[PDB]
Design a protein around this nucleic acid. Structure first.
Ligand code: ARG
Ligand code: MG
Ligand code: MG
Ligand code: MG
Ligand code: MG
Ligand code: MG
Ligand code: MG
Ligand code: MG
Ligand code: MG
Ligand code: MG
Ligand code: MG
Ligand code: MG
Ligand code: MG
Ligand code: MG
Ligand code: MG
Ligand code: MG
Ligand code: MG
Ligand code: MG
Ligand code: MG
Ligand code: MG
Ligand code: MG
Ligand code: MG
Ligand code: MG
Ligand code: MG
Ligand code: MG
Ligand code: MG
Ligand code: MG
Ligand code: MG
Ligand code: MG
Ligand code: MG
Ligand code: MG
Ligand code: MG
Ligand code: MG
Ligand code: MG
Ligand code: MG
Ligand code: MG
Ligand code: MG
Ligand code: MG
Ligand code: MG
Ligand code: MG
Ligand code: MG
Ligand code: MG
Ligand code: MG
Ligand code: MG
Ligand code: MG
Ligand code: MG
Ligand code: MG
Ligand code: MG
Ligand code: MG
Ligand code: MG
Ligand code: MG
Ligand code: MG
Ligand code: MG
Ligand code: MG
Ligand code: MG
Ligand code: MG
Ligand code: MG
Ligand code: MG
Ligand code: MG
Ligand code: MG
Ligand code: MG
Ligand code: MG
Ligand code: MG
Ligand code: MG
Ligand code: MG
Ligand code: MG
Ligand code: MG
Ligand code: MG
Ligand code: MG
Ligand code: MG
Ligand code: MG
Ligand code: MG
Ligand code: MG
Ligand code: MG
Ligand code: MG
Ligand code: MG
Ligand code: MG
Ligand code: MG
Ligand code: MG
Ligand code: MG
Ligand code: MG
Ligand code: MG
Ligand code: MG
Ligand code: MG
Ligand code: MG
Ligand code: MG
Ligand code: MG
Ligand code: MG
Ligand code: MG
Ligand code: MG
Ligand code: MG
Ligand code: MG
Ligand code: MG
Ligand code: MG
Ligand code: MG
Ligand code: MG
Ligand code: MG
Ligand code: MG
Ligand code: MG
Ligand code: MG
Ligand code: MG
Ligand code: MG
Ligand code: MG
Ligand code: MG
Ligand code: MG
Ligand code: MG
Ligand code: MG
Ligand code: MG
Ligand code: MG
Ligand code: MG
Ligand code: MG
Ligand code: MG
Ligand code: MG
Ligand code: MG
Ligand code: MG
Ligand code: MG
Ligand code: MG
Ligand code: MG
Ligand code: MG
Ligand code: MG
Ligand code: MG
Ligand code: MG
Ligand code: MG
Ligand code: MG
Ligand code: MG
Ligand code: MG
Ligand code: MG
Ligand code: MG
Ligand code: MG
Ligand code: MG
Ligand code: MG
Ligand code: MG
Ligand code: MG
Ligand code: MG
Ligand code: MG
Ligand code: MG
Ligand code: MG
Ligand code: MG
Ligand code: MG
Ligand code: MG
Ligand code: MG
Ligand code: MG
Ligand code: MG
Ligand code: MG
Ligand code: MG
Ligand code: MG
Ligand code: MG
Ligand code: MG
Ligand code: ZN
Lengths: 101, 151, 116, 112, 140, 59
RNA sequence: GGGAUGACCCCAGGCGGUAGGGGAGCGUUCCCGAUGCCGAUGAAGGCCGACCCGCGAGGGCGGCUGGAGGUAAGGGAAGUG
RNA sequence: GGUGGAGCCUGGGAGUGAGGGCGCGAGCGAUAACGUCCGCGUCCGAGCGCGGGAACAACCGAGACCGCCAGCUAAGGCCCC
RNA sequence: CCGUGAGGGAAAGGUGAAAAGAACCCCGGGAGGGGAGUGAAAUAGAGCCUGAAACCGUGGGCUUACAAGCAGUCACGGCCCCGAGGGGUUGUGGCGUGCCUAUUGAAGCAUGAGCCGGCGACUCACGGUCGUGGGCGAGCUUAAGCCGUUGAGGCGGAGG
């Protein structure tokens, strides 16, 4: 049994026992949240339109952090315009507990 | 610099750069551009600004109670050890840097070698030395002239 | 007081050469040529991370149109159905159902031929 | 175990002797000698002498058997340069680099 | 979650008759197969496409005056080496190359699409020696 | 003539590649049938002055 | 808007850019801080680092080299990149 | 009406005073020129950053703070590349 | 050293606390090295403190002989290393016109630069003019000097 949830403006396939990095959530670590659903399948197939009423995915907030550093560099030639920036992307690592629908 | 001034090689057709005298700062061992020279960093701060900072300085130590005066120095006569016995009895243990401010020479001579005492004729009491220190001591004399300088 | 270059210039040149490790020829061994290269790659990256999101969608789309055509229609005709049907599942997921879960996708196809 | 010789400041151009050293590397001591001996060039007199000087160090100072000896590692590094002038035509003087060599040779025992 | 990457897949063999079929509008299906863009698991940087065995390639059809006015060309490297070859004669000489040259240009450029054309095998006549492959004939 | 001269420094790789032919072909040696010392075929053995089975040189 | 004031929090909007104006910072030499603190259980410098904090310039941590110097919070002055 | 990186005033610091393509109105030119000289505007200049135009500073689209393997669109496009 | 001559004008410092500066033996003509020995340290061995970068070489891992290219960036995959992750490498697919300069406009077949390391360019004094942090305020301020100090400050009203 598997589910397509939508958090962080993006849609993910989840299953029990899945560690998932998603966009940061306002959620104290250790706590648990519910994720909207768009499609359940595997055993019995069910399609959201756009979502599904009662179905929800229960996840555990393992913690919050910051992805690796990406080097966003800007440079225009014959103009003396360089730019350098350090960017680390906030993010939330979840655990998929169950699929209650 | 101590070189000549001949144009080292012609202006044109040598195949290399343009140069004149090898004293140019673009050369090595040559001239220095905007390097230092003798200067009179001294300058004329306003009196009242010093006669006032000379009273603000003391007062600060006064707020702390770190200021102390004395009639005379009992039994000092030009030997450092004649002083610590005194300073001991005055609560001056050495745990605090001190500014000793008196006219009595012998006294200034006794403690001037002391790693935690700044000596001065009260005629030379200055803020920096005050702030430098953790405490401040004076003769009522040195106290008196003091008064008569901030007045 | 004088203050020559000292330890400053070198070190910075070792910043640029560490980021240049793996580059061909001097580009990794010559400072100057290491900068001139780190400049481009600096724009190539951000020029391309902006593209990853377009290189995939086009891919994803390329796989969906293949499956969709296994059921008798094309990527164009079933994007509309999922619209009219009110289905918002994305091409990334849609592109993975199309392969691993081919019978869920078949549903979506069906729920698309009808929504019209 | 290992035994090596090092002929330093050898006045010879490296990029020449190495053509000799590259010709004996990994060879049996007797096979090098046989090669260094009829290798029609000038760096052979030097690569050889170093080979022997190393074979001695092995047999005599490191308790190694002149019969197990092969050339484990040989490698010619370059040293300082003898910068000598060369008057060309029309008052211009060049600068020739008479090259000095660092010829090191490491021997081993191919047991069995 | 990441995108799916298909492990090595045993390719499939297709057999396409071309008799009567129109040239350019046949080679568009082939190249598609070669590319593999008919597979739900398509992948750009691998040869995950069918092999295409075309037959009766001498019977391809074409519209208009092309046999007389379609000029296959070559350049022999030297001066004056521009070879202008009409469609009529390529058939009456090396026909399996009218289709080949057509599909060839519908396959990408670079290595990959250069080894996809290899997976194309166009023979003139009703037979092919690839019987040992048991090709899955297609209708298009 | 107009003094031809290189337009660009030759890379390491480009010179070291051109030197894929500078390998020394080691000398051809064979044993002498009367002293077994290695030496080039077709030459009067420098180790025992033998050639063709007979003596020819002092060594 | 909170709260009262740059405490951090929420809502909204701005942020392509040469010449050029402006603002806030890093880093090098030097002085007070310093008759102090760090240092042979190893200073400055040098080679690596995929770890830490910083938008970035840069700052620490660790390992190898190195073998006698270095220098904090806070300020001052320039032969300062 | 309009609260906008709008306007007025005083004051400090500049750079610019070699522009160019396009569109419309003219002169000059041959109802020539990637020609030239003015006027309103636009763009490049400084957006040689992005999409389209096969490729191309100025034609069409659109004003790039940063990150996403999410969605909708503009010009332009949907047989294959 | 250059110049007939006036005249021009360099480069070049450092072992170690102490020479205790490597007896003797070994390969070699020697140079040089290999053990022994000294030293806390000998890639501190006199061609010596630290020893960076270009540059050269030896061994190892990945990779390359139907490919095309400002050499890199994104995605994926294979092999190697380190112990749902990372590091090195590059086969394929996508994209992609160096840096600086001067230009209406350059990848630009316009200028400069082979490469690396160090020197290398907006300052100073007086006067002026805005701004600014302070001190005093119809008042503010001293200059040369005199005394003091020996990194002590105070006096000095002429004058502006
Ligand atoms: N007695 C005096 N006035 N002493 C003033 C200090 C003199 C000298 N600088 C010292 O430190 O010894
Ligand atoms: Mg450019
Ligand atoms: Mg440039
Ligand atoms: Mg520039
Ligand atoms: Mg620039
Ligand atoms: Mg985040
Ligand atoms: Mg002079
Ligand atoms: Mg002189
Ligand atoms: Mg000359
Ligand atoms: Mg002159
Ligand atoms: Mg000179
Ligand atoms: Mg001069
Ligand atoms: Mg000088
Ligand atoms: Mg000199
Ligand atoms: Mg000189
Ligand atoms: Mg200078
Ligand atoms: Mg000057
Ligand atoms: Mg000058
Ligand atoms: Mg003076
Ligand atoms: Mg000044
Ligand atoms: Mg003065
Ligand atoms: Mg003190
Ligand atoms: Mg003292
Ligand atoms: Mg400098
Ligand atoms: Mg430096
Ligand atoms: Mg620098
Ligand atoms: Mg640095
Ligand atoms: Mg960079
Ligand atoms: Mg892009
Ligand atoms: Mg997009
Ligand atoms: Mg693709
Ligand atoms: Mg159809
Ligand atoms: Mg949708
Ligand atoms: Mg599967
Ligand atoms: Mg030979
Ligand atoms: Mg022997
Ligand atoms: Mg000659
Ligand atoms: Mg001459
Ligand atoms: Mg002559
Ligand atoms: Mg040379
Ligand atoms: Mg089909
Ligand atoms: Mg298609
Ligand atoms: Mg294929
Ligand atoms: Mg036709
Ligand atoms: Mg034929
Ligand atoms: Mg000629
Ligand atoms: Mg002639
Ligand atoms: Mg040339
Ligand atoms: Mg190389
Ligand atoms: Mg090499
Ligand atoms: Mg070559
Ligand atoms: Mg004999
Ligand atoms: Mg901006
Ligand atoms: Mg904006
Ligand atoms: Mg703007
Ligand atoms: Mg500017
Ligand atoms: Mg401001
Ligand atoms: Mg500022
Ligand atoms: Mg600072
Ligand atoms: Mg600095
Ligand atoms: Mg001190
Ligand atoms: Mg000190
Ligand atoms: Mg010790
Ligand atoms: Mg240590
Ligand atoms: Mg220093
Ligand atoms: Mg420091
Ligand atoms: Mg260190
Ligand atoms: Mg000392
Ligand atoms: Mg300091
Ligand atoms: Mg500080
Ligand atoms: Mg201070
Ligand atoms: Mg300077
Ligand atoms: Mg300077
Ligand atoms: Mg306003
Ligand atoms: Mg404005
Ligand atoms: Mg304005
Ligand atoms: Mg103004
Ligand atoms: Mg003018
Ligand atoms: Mg002009
Ligand atoms: Mg001008
Ligand atoms: Mg003008
Ligand atoms: Mg004009
Ligand atoms: Mg014009
Ligand atoms: Mg144009
Ligand atoms: Mg026009
Ligand atoms: Mg019109
Ligand atoms: Mg018109
Ligand atoms: Mg007109
Ligand atoms: Mg007119
Ligand atoms: Mg015109
Ligand atoms: Mg003109
Ligand atoms: Mg004009
Ligand atoms: Mg420009
Ligand atoms: Mg301009
Ligand atoms: Mg534009
Ligand atoms: Mg604009
Ligand atoms: Mg544009
Ligand atoms: Mg550009
Ligand atoms: Mg460009
Ligand atoms: Mg464009
Ligand atoms: Mg384009
Ligand atoms: Mg295009
Ligand atoms: Mg706009
Ligand atoms: Mg849509
Ligand atoms: Mg088209
Ligand atoms: Mg093509
Ligand atoms: Mg003369
Ligand atoms: Mg002479
Ligand atoms: Mg002269
Ligand atoms: Mg001398
Ligand atoms: Mg010494
Ligand atoms: Mg001896
Ligand atoms: Mg001897
Ligand atoms: Mg001997
Ligand atoms: Mg000796
Ligand atoms: Mg020795
Ligand atoms: Mg010992
Ligand atoms: Mg020790
Ligand atoms: Mg040590
Ligand atoms: Mg060392
Ligand atoms: Mg040492
Ligand atoms: Mg020393
Ligand atoms: Mg050394
Ligand atoms: Mg050395
Ligand atoms: Mg190698
Ligand atoms: Mg081929
Ligand atoms: Mg191959
Ligand atoms: Mg991909
Ligand atoms: Mg683990
Ligand atoms: Mg392409
Ligand atoms: Mg590529
Ligand atoms: Mg472009
Ligand atoms: Mg361009
Ligand atoms: Mg120019
Ligand atoms: Mg020009
Ligand atoms: Mg070019
Ligand atoms: Mg060129
Ligand atoms: Mg020019
Ligand atoms: Mg330039
Ligand atoms: Mg040169
Ligand atoms: Mg440099
Ligand atoms: Mg400057
Ligand atoms: Mg100025
Ligand atoms: Mg100056
Ligand atoms: Mg000034
Ligand atoms: Mg002023
Ligand atoms: Mg005042
Ligand atoms: Mg006054
Ligand atoms: Zn013989």
């Amino acid at each position: 049994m598997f589910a397509i949830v939508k958090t962080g403006g993006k849609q993910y396939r989840v299953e029990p026992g899945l560690k998932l990095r998603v966009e940061k959530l306002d959620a104290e670590p250790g706590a648990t949240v519910e994720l909207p659903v768009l499609l359940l399948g595997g055993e019995k197939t069910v399609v959201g339109t756009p979502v599904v009423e009662g179905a929800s995915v229960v996840a555990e907030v393992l913690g919050h952090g910051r992805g690796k550093k990406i080097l966003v560099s800007k440079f225009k030639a014959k103009v003396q315009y360089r730019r350098k920036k350090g960017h680390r992307q906030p993010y939330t690592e979840l655990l998929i507990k169950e699929i209650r629908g | 610099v101590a070189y000549s001034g001949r144009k080292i090689w012609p202006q044109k057709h040598t195949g290399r750069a343009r140069h004149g005298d090898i004293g140019a700062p673009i050369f090595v061992g040559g001239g220095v551009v905007f390097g230092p020279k003798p200067r009179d960093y001294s300058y004329t701060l306003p009196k009242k600004v010093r006669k006032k900072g000379l009273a603000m300085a003391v007062a600060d130590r006064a707020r702390e109670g770190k200021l102390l005066l004395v009639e005379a120095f009992a039994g000092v006569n030009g030997k450092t050890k004649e002083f610590l016995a005194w300073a001991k009895e005055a609560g001056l243990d050495g745990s605090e840097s001190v500014l000793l401010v008196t006219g009595n020479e012998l006294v200034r001579r006794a403690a001037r070698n002391l790693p935690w005492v700044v000596t001065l004729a009260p005629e030379g009491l200055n803020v920096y030395d005050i702030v430098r220190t953790e405490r401040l001591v004076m003769d009522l004399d040195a106290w008196e002239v003091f008064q008569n300088r901030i007045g | 007081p004088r203050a020559k270059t000292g330890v400053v210039r070198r070190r910075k040149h070792k910043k640029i050469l560490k980021l240049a490790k793996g580059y061909w020829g001097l580009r990794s061994k010559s400072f100057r040529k290491a900068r001139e290269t780190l400049f481009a790659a600096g724009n190539y990256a951000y020029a391309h991370r902006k593209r990853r999101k377009r290189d995939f969608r086009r891919l994803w789309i390329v796989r969906i149109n293949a499956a969709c055509r296994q059921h008798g229609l094309n990527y164009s005709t079933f994007i509309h159905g999922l619209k009219k049907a009110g289905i918002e599942v994305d091409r990334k997921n849609l592109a993975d159902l199309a392969v691993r879960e081919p019978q869920v996708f078949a549903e979506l196809v069906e729920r698309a031929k009808a929504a019209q | 175990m290992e035994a090596k010789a090092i002929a330093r400041y050898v006045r010879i151009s490296p990029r020449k002797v190495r053509l000799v050293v590259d010709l004996i590397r990994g060879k049996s001591l007797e096979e090098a000698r046989n090669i260094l001996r009829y290798t029609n060039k000038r760096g052979a007199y030097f690569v050889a002498k170093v080979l022997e000087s190393a074979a001695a160090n092995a047999v005599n100072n490191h308790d190694m058997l002149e019969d197990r000896l092969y050339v484990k590692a040989a490698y010619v590094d370059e040293g300082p340069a003898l910068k000598r002038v060369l008057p060309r035509a029309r008052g211009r003087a060049d600068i020739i680099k008479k090259r000095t060599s660092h010829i090191t040779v490491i021997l081993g025992e191919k047991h069995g | 979650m990441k995108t799916y990457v298909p492990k090595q897949v045993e390719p499939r063999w297709v057999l396409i008759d071309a008799e009567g079929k129109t040239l350019g509008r046949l080679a568009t299906k082939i190249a598609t197969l070669l590319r593999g863009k008919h597979r739900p698991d398509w992948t750009p940087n691998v040869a995950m496409g069918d092999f295409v065995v075309v037959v009766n390639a001498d019977k391809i059809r074409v519209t208009g005056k092309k046999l007389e006015q379609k000029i296959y060309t070559r350049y022999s490297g030297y001066p004056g080496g521009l070879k202008k070859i009409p469609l009529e004669k390529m058939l009456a000489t090396h026909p399996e190359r009218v289709l080949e040259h057509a599909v060839k240009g519908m396959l990408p450029k670079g290595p990959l699409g250069r080894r996809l054309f290899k997976r194309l095998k166009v023979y003139a006549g009703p037979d092919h020696p690839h019987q040992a492959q048991r090709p899955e004939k297609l209708e298009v | 003539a107009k003094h031809p001269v290189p337009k660009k420094k030759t890379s390491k790789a480009r010179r070291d590649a051109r030197r894929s032919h500078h390998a020394l072909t080691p000398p051809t040696l064979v044993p002498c049938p009367e002293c077994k010392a290695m030496k080039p075929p077709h030459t009067v053995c420098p180790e025992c002055g033998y050639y063709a089975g007979r003596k020819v040189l002092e060594v």
